[PDB]
Symmetry: none
Subunit: 142 residues, 2 copies
């Protein structure tokens, strides 16, 4: 399927949710949010991906941890855009669906910004992670 540019930096380890996405449409967005977004974990059907970010508690040296946020999506609800601010890491993430505008994860939005539109809805994400979210790529449904 069509995918966006990779947004972020070259650090961290690669992740790619193509396989876990076989379980279903995205039904839920879980993130950890402080002045920046420190992890993302989508639910595909009833199956979560792994926690992409906040590799371990020693990461508190390099950023705050943040609050666990959970946005449940209804059946037929899908993510139609993502506004990402990023430098060497993803700084903040704002998702919009065909029903809702979700709050920004990451109170700071000072880095360069990109708006990715995903007609028909996001299928899954890939990117890089470690203590935080090094980068993201958005994969469309076809």
């Amino acid at each position: 399927q069509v995918a966006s540019e990779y947004l972020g930096g070259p650090g961290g380890d690669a992740f790619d949710d193509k396989a876990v996405a076989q379980n279903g449409d995205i039904t839920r967005i879980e993130m950890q949010c402080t002045d920046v977004a420190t992890y993302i974990k989508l639910r595909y059907g009833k199956v979560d991906s792994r926690q992409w970010g906040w590799g371990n508690e020693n990461c508190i040296q390099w950023s705050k941890k943040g609050e666990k946020v959970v946005h449940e999506l209804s059946s037929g609800e899908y993510i139609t855009s993502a506004i990402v601010t990023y430098g060497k890491y993803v700084q903040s993430i704002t998702f919009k669906t065909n029903k809702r505008t979700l709050p920004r994860c990451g109170t700071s939005a000072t880095e360069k910004s990109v708006t990715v539109l995903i007609p028909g809805g996001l299928k899954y994400i890939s990117g890089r992670w470690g203590c935080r979210i090094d980068g993201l790529r958005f994969h469309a449904k076809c």
Copy 2:
């Protein structure tokens, strides 16, 4: 049908390539390019749409004209994304295919930018036009 939202302003006249797209998958992109994109004209199989933009040569009384640009797509190459800057009009357009990012049409990229993913490849465009490209909507094959 999956399609993007309409990007641009309310001027000019609507156009819609839905009917002409029955002639085939997109095989070529023709645009006219200066500081802004002043027309677009796709080829569907062997058949072109009308020229959407630069309605007449007296348009030089409001904007620059630009030079003709043609991108020929290979068989099995399809348009997967467009980076569009826009306000009252479409300002610049950067197409990407499943094989390559193409050159931007319109050297000025200062207005609101979005990266439109076009799932399964672009099937056809609709929009509005006059002396320039008042707006665009991308209709995906999938």
